[PDB]
Amino acid sequence: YPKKGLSPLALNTMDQFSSRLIPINYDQLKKLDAGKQIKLETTQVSGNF
Amino acid sequence: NVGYQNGFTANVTTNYSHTTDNSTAVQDSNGESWNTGLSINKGESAYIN
């Protein structure tokens, strides 16, 4: 969506229109220190043709 | 102060004030005292007949 050779986008920019930040306890931080990783999952999208 | 209310928010306040004061007081007092006491001379303390 940013095309070939651009800058990335933002998530939860501090403005009038946002949502809250997402917190992490000590344990999931330790799991990130270990060998498990984070999966992003798109459940369903919406568009027009 | 900072916080989250309809998104991020922040507030900086300054303040100054100046007070004056004055006062009176009146104090009364009353008291008594007693005192007793003994004296003697060791040597040449007694007379006889």
CSV table of N, CA and C in Angstrom, one decimal:
chain,number,residue,atom,x,y,z
A,1,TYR,N,0.8,-1.2,0.0
A,1,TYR,CA,0.0,0.0,0.0
A,1,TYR,C,0.9,1.3,0.0
A,2,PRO,N,1.9,1.4,0.8
A,2,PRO,CA,2.9,2.3,0.4
A,2,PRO,C,3.7,1.6,-0.7
A,3,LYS,N,4.0,2.3,-1.8
A,3,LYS,CA,4.5,1.7,-3.0
A,3,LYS,C,6.0,1.4,-2.9
A,4,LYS,N,6.5,1.1,-4.0
A,4,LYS,CA,7.9,0.6,-4.1
A,4,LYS,C,8.9,1.6,-3.6
A,5,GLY,N,9.5,1.4,-2.4
A,5,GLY,CA,10.4,2.3,-1.9
A,5,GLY,C,9.9,3.5,-1.1
A,6,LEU,N,9.0,3.3,-0.1
A,6,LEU,CA,8.5,4.3,0.7
A,6,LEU,C,8.7,4.1,2.2
A,7,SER,N,8.1,5.0,3.0
A,7,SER,CA,8.1,5.0,4.4
A,7,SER,C,6.9,4.2,4.9
A,8,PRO,N,7.0,3.6,6.1
A,8,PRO,CA,5.9,2.9,6.7
A,8,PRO,C,4.8,3.8,7.2
A,9,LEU,N,3.7,3.1,7.8
A,9,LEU,CA,2.6,3.8,8.3
A,9,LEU,C,2.7,3.8,9.9
A,10,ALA,N,1.6,4.3,10.5
A,10,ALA,CA,1.6,4.4,11.9
A,10,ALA,C,0.5,3.5,12.5
A,11,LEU,N,0.6,3.3,13.8
A,11,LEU,CA,-0.4,2.6,14.6
A,11,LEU,C,-0.6,3.2,15.9
A,12,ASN,N,-1.9,3.6,16.2
A,12,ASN,CA,-2.3,4.3,17.4
A,12,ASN,C,-1.5,5.6,17.6
A,13,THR,N,-1.5,6.4,16.6
A,13,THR,CA,-1.0,7.8,16.7
A,13,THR,C,-1.8,8.5,17.8
A,14,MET,N,-1.1,9.4,18.5
A,14,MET,CA,-1.7,10.1,19.6
A,14,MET,C,-2.5,11.3,19.1
A,15,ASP,N,-3.8,11.2,19.0
A,15,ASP,CA,-4.6,12.2,18.4
A,15,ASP,C,-6.0,12.3,19.1
A,16,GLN,N,-6.9,13.0,18.4
A,16,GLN,CA,-8.3,13.0,18.8
A,16,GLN,C,-9.0,11.7,18.6
A,17,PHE,N,-8.5,10.9,17.6
A,17,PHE,CA,-9.2,9.7,17.2
A,17,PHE,C,-8.2,8.5,17.2
A,18,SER,N,-8.2,7.8,18.3
A,18,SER,CA,-7.2,6.7,18.4
A,18,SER,C,-7.9,5.6,19.3
A,19,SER,N,-7.1,4.6,19.7
A,19,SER,CA,-7.5,3.7,20.7
A,19,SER,C,-6.3,3.5,21.7
A,20,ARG,N,-6.5,2.8,22.7
A,20,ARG,CA,-5.5,2.7,23.8
A,20,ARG,C,-4.3,1.8,23.4
A,21,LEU,N,-3.2,2.1,24.0
A,21,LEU,CA,-2.0,1.2,23.8
A,21,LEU,C,-2.2,-0.2,24.4
A,22,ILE,N,-1.4,-1.1,23.9
A,22,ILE,CA,-1.6,-2.5,24.3
A,22,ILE,C,-0.5,-2.9,25.3
A,23,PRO,N,-0.9,-3.4,26.5
A,23,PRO,CA,0.1,-3.7,27.5
A,23,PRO,C,0.5,-5.1,27.5
A,24,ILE,N,1.8,-5.3,28.0
A,24,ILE,CA,2.4,-6.6,28.0
A,24,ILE,C,3.0,-6.8,29.4
A,25,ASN,N,2.7,-8.0,30.0
A,25,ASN,CA,3.2,-8.3,31.4
A,25,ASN,C,4.6,-8.8,31.2
A,26,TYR,N,5.2,-9.2,32.4
A,26,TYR,CA,6.6,-9.6,32.4
A,26,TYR,C,6.8,-11.0,31.7
A,27,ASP,N,5.7,-11.8,31.7
A,27,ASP,CA,5.8,-13.2,31.2
A,27,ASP,C,5.9,-13.2,29.7
A,28,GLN,N,5.0,-12.5,29.0
A,28,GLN,CA,5.0,-12.4,27.6
A,28,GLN,C,6.3,-11.8,27.1
A,29,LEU,N,6.8,-10.8,27.8
A,29,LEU,CA,8.1,-10.2,27.5
A,29,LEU,C,9.2,-11.3,27.6
A,30,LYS,N,9.2,-12.1,28.6
A,30,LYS,CA,10.1,-13.2,28.7
A,30,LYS,C,10.0,-14.2,27.6
A,31,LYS,N,8.7,-14.4,27.1
A,31,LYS,CA,8.5,-15.3,26.0
A,31,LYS,C,9.1,-14.7,24.7
A,32,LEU,N,9.0,-13.4,24.5
A,32,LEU,CA,9.6,-12.8,23.4
A,32,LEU,C,11.1,-12.8,23.5
A,33,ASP,N,11.7,-12.8,24.7
A,33,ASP,CA,13.1,-13.1,24.9
A,33,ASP,C,13.4,-14.5,24.5
A,34,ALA,N,12.5,-15.5,24.7
A,34,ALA,CA,12.7,-16.8,24.2
A,34,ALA,C,12.3,-16.9,22.8
A,35,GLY,N,12.2,-18.2,22.3
A,35,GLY,CA,12.1,-18.4,20.8
A,35,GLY,C,10.7,-18.4,20.2
A,36,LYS,N,9.7,-17.8,20.8
A,36,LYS,CA,8.4,-17.7,20.1
A,36,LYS,C,8.2,-16.3,19.6
A,37,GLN,N,7.4,-16.1,18.6
A,37,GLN,CA,7.3,-14.9,17.8
A,37,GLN,C,5.8,-14.5,17.7
A,38,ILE,N,5.6,-13.3,17.1
A,38,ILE,CA,4.3,-12.7,17.0
A,38,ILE,C,3.7,-12.8,15.7
A,39,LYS,N,2.5,-13.4,15.6
A,39,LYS,CA,1.8,-13.5,14.3
A,39,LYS,C,0.7,-12.5,14.2
A,40,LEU,N,0.7,-11.8,13.1
A,40,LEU,CA,-0.4,-10.9,12.7
A,40,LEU,C,-1.4,-11.7,11.9
A,41,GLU,N,-2.7,-11.5,12.1
A,41,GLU,CA,-3.7,-12.4,11.6
A,41,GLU,C,-4.8,-11.4,11.1
A,42,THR,N,-5.1,-11.4,9.8
A,42,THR,CA,-6.2,-10.7,9.2
A,42,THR,C,-7.4,-11.6,9.2
A,43,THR,N,-8.4,-11.4,10.0
A,43,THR,CA,-9.6,-12.2,10.0
A,43,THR,C,-10.4,-12.0,8.8
A,44,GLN,N,-10.8,-10.8,8.5
A,44,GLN,CA,-11.7,-10.5,7.3
A,44,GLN,C,-11.5,-9.1,6.9
A,45,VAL,N,-11.5,-8.8,5.6
A,45,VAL,CA,-11.3,-7.5,5.0
A,45,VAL,C,-12.6,-7.1,4.3
A,46,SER,N,-12.6,-5.9,3.8
A,46,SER,CA,-13.7,-5.3,3.2
A,46,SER,C,-13.3,-4.3,2.0
A,47,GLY,N,-13.9,-4.5,0.9
A,47,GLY,CA,-13.6,-3.7,-0.3
A,47,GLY,C,-14.7,-3.6,-1.3
A,48,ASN,N,-14.3,-3.0,-2.4
A,48,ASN,CA,-15.3,-2.8,-3.5
A,48,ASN,C,-14.5,-3.0,-4.8
A,49,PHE,N,-15.3,-3.4,-5.9
A,49,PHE,CA,-14.7,-3.7,-7.2
A,49,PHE,C,-15.3,-2.8,-8.2
B,1,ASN,N,0.0,17.1,34.0
B,1,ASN,CA,-0.7,15.8,34.1
B,1,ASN,C,-0.9,15.3,32.7
B,2,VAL,N,-0.8,14.0,32.5
B,2,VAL,CA,-1.1,13.4,31.2
B,2,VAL,C,-2.2,12.3,31.5
B,3,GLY,N,-2.8,11.9,30.4
B,3,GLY,CA,-3.8,10.8,30.5
B,3,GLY,C,-4.4,10.5,29.1
B,4,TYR,N,-5.4,9.6,29.2
B,4,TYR,CA,-6.1,9.2,28.0
B,4,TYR,C,-7.6,9.4,28.2
B,5,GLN,N,-8.1,10.4,27.4
B,5,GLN,CA,-9.5,10.7,27.4
B,5,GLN,C,-9.9,11.2,26.0
B,6,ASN,N,-10.6,10.3,25.2
B,6,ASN,CA,-10.9,10.5,23.8
B,6,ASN,C,-9.6,10.7,23.0
B,7,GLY,N,-8.6,9.8,23.3
B,7,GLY,CA,-7.3,10.0,22.8
B,7,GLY,C,-6.4,10.5,23.9
B,8,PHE,N,-5.1,10.8,23.5
B,8,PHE,CA,-4.1,11.3,24.4
B,8,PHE,C,-4.5,12.8,24.8
B,9,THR,N,-4.2,13.1,26.1
B,9,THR,CA,-4.3,14.5,26.5
B,9,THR,C,-3.3,14.9,27.6
B,10,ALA,N,-3.0,16.2,27.7
B,10,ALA,CA,-2.0,16.7,28.6
B,10,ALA,C,-2.4,18.1,29.0
B,11,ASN,N,-1.9,18.5,30.2
B,11,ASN,CA,-2.2,19.8,30.7
B,11,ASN,C,-1.0,20.3,31.6
B,12,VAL,N,-0.7,21.5,31.4
B,12,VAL,CA,0.4,22.1,32.2
B,12,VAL,C,-0.2,23.3,32.9
B,13,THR,N,-0.1,23.4,34.2
B,13,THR,CA,-0.6,24.5,35.0
B,13,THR,C,0.5,25.1,35.8
B,14,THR,N,0.4,26.5,35.9
B,14,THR,CA,1.2,27.2,36.8
B,14,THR,C,0.3,28.0,37.8
B,15,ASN,N,0.9,28.5,38.9
B,15,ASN,CA,0.2,29.0,40.0
B,15,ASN,C,1.1,29.9,40.9
B,16,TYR,N,0.6,30.9,41.5
B,16,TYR,CA,1.2,31.7,42.5
B,16,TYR,C,0.2,32.4,43.3
B,17,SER,N,0.6,32.6,44.6
B,17,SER,CA,-0.3,33.3,45.6
B,17,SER,C,0.5,33.9,46.7
B,18,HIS,N,-0.2,34.8,47.4
B,18,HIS,CA,0.5,35.7,48.4
B,18,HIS,C,-0.5,36.0,49.5
B,19,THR,N,-0.1,35.6,50.7
B,19,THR,CA,-1.0,35.7,51.9
B,19,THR,C,-0.5,36.6,52.9
B,20,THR,N,-1.4,37.3,53.7
B,20,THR,CA,-1.0,38.1,54.8
B,20,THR,C,-1.9,37.7,56.0
B,21,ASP,N,-1.4,38.1,57.2
B,21,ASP,CA,-2.1,37.7,58.4
B,21,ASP,C,-1.6,38.6,59.6
B,22,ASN,N,-2.5,38.8,60.6
B,22,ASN,CA,-2.1,39.5,61.8
B,22,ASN,C,-3.0,39.0,62.9
B,23,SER,N,-2.5,39.1,64.2
B,23,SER,CA,-3.2,38.5,65.3
B,23,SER,C,-2.9,39.3,66.6
B,24,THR,N,-3.8,39.1,67.6
B,24,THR,CA,-3.6,39.6,68.9
B,24,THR,C,-3.8,38.4,69.9
B,25,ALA,N,-3.4,38.7,71.2
B,25,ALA,CA,-3.5,37.7,72.2
B,25,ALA,C,-3.4,38.4,73.6
B,26,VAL,N,-4.0,37.9,74.6
B,26,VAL,CA,-4.0,38.4,75.9
B,26,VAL,C,-3.9,37.3,76.9
B,27,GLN,N,-3.0,37.4,77.9
B,27,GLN,CA,-2.7,36.2,78.8
B,27,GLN,C,-2.7,36.7,80.2
B,28,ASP,N,-3.4,36.0,81.1
B,28,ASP,CA,-3.5,36.3,82.5
B,28,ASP,C,-2.8,35.2,83.3
B,29,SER,N,-2.5,35.5,84.6
B,29,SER,CA,-1.8,34.6,85.4
B,29,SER,C,-2.0,34.9,86.9
B,30,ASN,N,-2.1,33.8,87.7
B,30,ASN,CA,-2.2,33.9,89.2
B,30,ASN,C,-1.5,32.7,89.8
B,31,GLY,N,-1.0,32.8,91.0
B,31,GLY,CA,-0.3,31.7,91.6
B,31,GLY,C,0.0,32.0,93.1
B,32,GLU,N,0.2,30.9,93.8
B,32,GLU,CA,0.6,30.9,95.2
B,32,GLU,C,1.9,30.1,95.4
B,33,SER,N,2.4,30.2,96.6
B,33,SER,CA,3.6,29.4,97.0
B,33,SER,C,3.6,29.3,98.5
B,34,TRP,N,4.2,28.1,99.0
B,34,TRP,CA,4.5,27.9,100.4
B,34,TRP,C,5.9,27.5,100.5
B,35,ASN,N,6.5,27.6,101.7
B,35,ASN,CA,7.9,27.2,101.9
B,35,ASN,C,8.1,27.0,103.4
B,36,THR,N,8.7,25.9,103.8
B,36,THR,CA,9.2,25.6,105.1
B,36,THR,C,10.6,25.2,105.1
B,37,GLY,N,11.3,25.2,106.2
B,37,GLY,CA,12.7,24.9,106.3
B,37,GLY,C,13.3,24.9,107.7
B,38,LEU,N,14.4,24.1,107.8
B,38,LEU,CA,15.0,23.8,109.1
B,38,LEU,C,16.5,24.3,109.0
B,39,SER,N,17.1,24.7,110.2
B,39,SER,CA,18.5,25.0,110.3
B,39,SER,C,19.0,24.4,111.6
B,40,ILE,N,20.3,24.2,111.6
B,40,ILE,CA,21.0,23.6,112.8
B,40,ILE,C,22.5,23.9,112.7
B,41,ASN,N,23.2,23.7,113.8
B,41,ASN,CA,24.6,23.8,113.9
B,41,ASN,C,25.2,22.5,114.5
B,42,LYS,N,25.9,21.8,113.7
B,42,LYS,CA,26.6,20.6,114.3
B,42,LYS,C,27.7,21.1,115.2
B,43,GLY,N,27.6,20.7,116.4
B,43,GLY,CA,28.5,21.3,117.4
B,43,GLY,C,27.9,22.5,118.0
B,44,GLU,N,27.9,22.6,119.3
B,44,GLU,CA,27.2,23.7,120.0
B,44,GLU,C,25.7,23.8,119.6
B,45,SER,N,25.1,22.6,119.7
B,45,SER,CA,23.7,22.5,119.3
B,45,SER,C,22.7,22.3,120.4
B,46,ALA,N,23.2,22.0,121.6
B,46,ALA,CA,22.3,21.7,122.7
B,46,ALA,C,22.8,22.3,124.0
B,47,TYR,N,21.9,22.7,124.8
B,47,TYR,CA,22.2,23.3,126.1
B,47,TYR,C,21.5,22.4,127.2
B,48,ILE,N,22.1,22.3,128.4
B,48,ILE,CA,21.6,21.5,129.4
B,48,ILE,C,21.6,22.3,130.7
B,49,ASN,N,20.8,21.8,131.7
B,49,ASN,CA,20.8,22.3,133.0
B,49,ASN,C,20.6,21.1,134.0
